[PDB]
Amino acid sequence: IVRCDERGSLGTSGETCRCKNNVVGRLCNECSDGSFHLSKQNPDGCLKCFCMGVSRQCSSSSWSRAQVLGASEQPSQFSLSNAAGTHTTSEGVSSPAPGELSFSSFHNLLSEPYFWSLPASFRGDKVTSYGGELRFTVMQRPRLSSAPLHRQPLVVLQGNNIVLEHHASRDPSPGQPSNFIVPFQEQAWQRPDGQPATREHLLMALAGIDALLIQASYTQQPAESRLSGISMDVAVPENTGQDSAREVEQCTCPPGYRGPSCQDCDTGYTRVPSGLYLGTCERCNCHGHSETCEPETGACQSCQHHTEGASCEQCQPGYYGDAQRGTPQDCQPCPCYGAPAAGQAAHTCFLDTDGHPTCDSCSPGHSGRHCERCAPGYYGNPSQGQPCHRDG
Structure with a gap:
């Protein structure tokens, strides 16, 4: 009997092994071309290299896991936002301890859902968050009369003109705290219309986070909302003692690209808005x-x-x-003589329609294209060295 690889097989006809989509090899224990990270939890066996579409060669990062903590940020840096981020405020946001946030001035807000808007250290390039989790605790209370909202995002991720949403399986009950664990994996996110996230799309949002928004209102008339215990997984090059970020792709980028997913233009290259993903990098x-x-x-x-x-x-x-x-x-x-008028830095002159320079910041009482003579009602010879003083 052959012992088929438990991570990579779908099953076994006892003598043959049936591999998941992205797996290959007699015992289904190798990733296929353009794949990496064999795991039992992945139904396809191996993830697909994405590499912002510019490369198909990649393997598991060996960056280490670390967390961005809410406690790391000044409470001043948290605020409330609507999904569209057209209405934001931090008036009323207070913090009873570091990384713990509290709000109870909904009377000042319009009638729409508000989110906690995580500060900058949670945004920007978070491709390495892939395969990790955003963790947090919420507690909410409605004003006395207030049904929960229907089908509202627990989390909205906005980056690179993509919006993805994560919806909770349970709403937090009034006046008691709920722990959430939101995975950065496509399976847990949808588009607003409710289409499944793709791996490509999640990555493109993560690579350029513009907002990361946590539900704060929960009901139609919220009274009170509190947020704490905020933990976002990342990966860092330094060794931290934590597991390595195996789900994070380390691409071999072509010339002009860098980042673990070829998301950045390298030295000597700049972004060109092309088609499909982030665009291309040109010189x-x-x-x-x-x-x-x-x-x-x-x-x-x-x-x-x-x-x-x-x-x-x-x-x-x-x-x-x-x-x-x-x-x-x-x-x-510029071949000009004397001092510049209105006591300027240097002398300005331009290439004149005849192929020779003309000075146009000549001093007062200078003349000619090089400021070389003196104007009328002035005297002196700049070519030889003297300045031009007026007549009397």
Whole structure:
């Protein structure tokens, strides 16, 4: 009899092994191409590499698990929001202990569900939260007359133009605390219309969290809402002593990408809004004046050769030429004489329609394209060195 792998088999015709979708091998104990992390709990056996669509080669991160705690954040940093985040406030939010939050001024709010809006340390790039959990305790009380709400999200995750929701199997009873454990796995999230989350979509939201919202109202007329014991799983490169983040994909990215899922443009590359996921990463457009730029916006950085602008497209003041040509000598020093008018920093001049510079920040009582003569009712010779003083 063959002993089929317990993590990877669906069953056994005693002499053959039947593998889950993403599993391969005689004993169904290997992940298929584009898969990683064999586990018994995964019905498909192995997760699929996603890698923001730019790679199919990945394996389990060996980052360690750690938690972001609510206690880590100033209570000032918590607030209430509607789902749309068009109505927010922290007026009334108080904290009786660190990481514990309390609210009881619903009279000041409109008649819609409000959420606790977790602060920044819970947002941004949380791809490594995949395969972990958001944990928390809530307690709620309605005003005397108030039915629960119907089908309301316990948690809303918003990132990268995706909204996913997690709905609780039970509502918290009035005036007693409930522990929730929300897994970062597709099975636990749906779109607002109630379509299942995909792995790809959960990852894209997690990679760019803009809001992470916990239900605070629960009923139509809430009296009181309290939040505590907030714990969000992540993964860090440092060893922490906790298990490694095996569900977190470590992709081999192509040139121009980094992050464990190729979610970031690498040094010398910037985001291009393309199609399907986050877009693609292309090389900086810096007119040859730079190799580094803002990964998301595109703005060039540390423009060389006396250039400036978002593409290093212009010569810095005190220089003239065509920075767009792309050579180191593109921009030349303005050949002006004397002091700049209204006592300026440097001298401005521009490349005139004749291929030669003209100075346009000449001092008063200067003249000519290089500020080299003196205006009428003035005297002196700047070329030789003297300034220009007025007549009498």
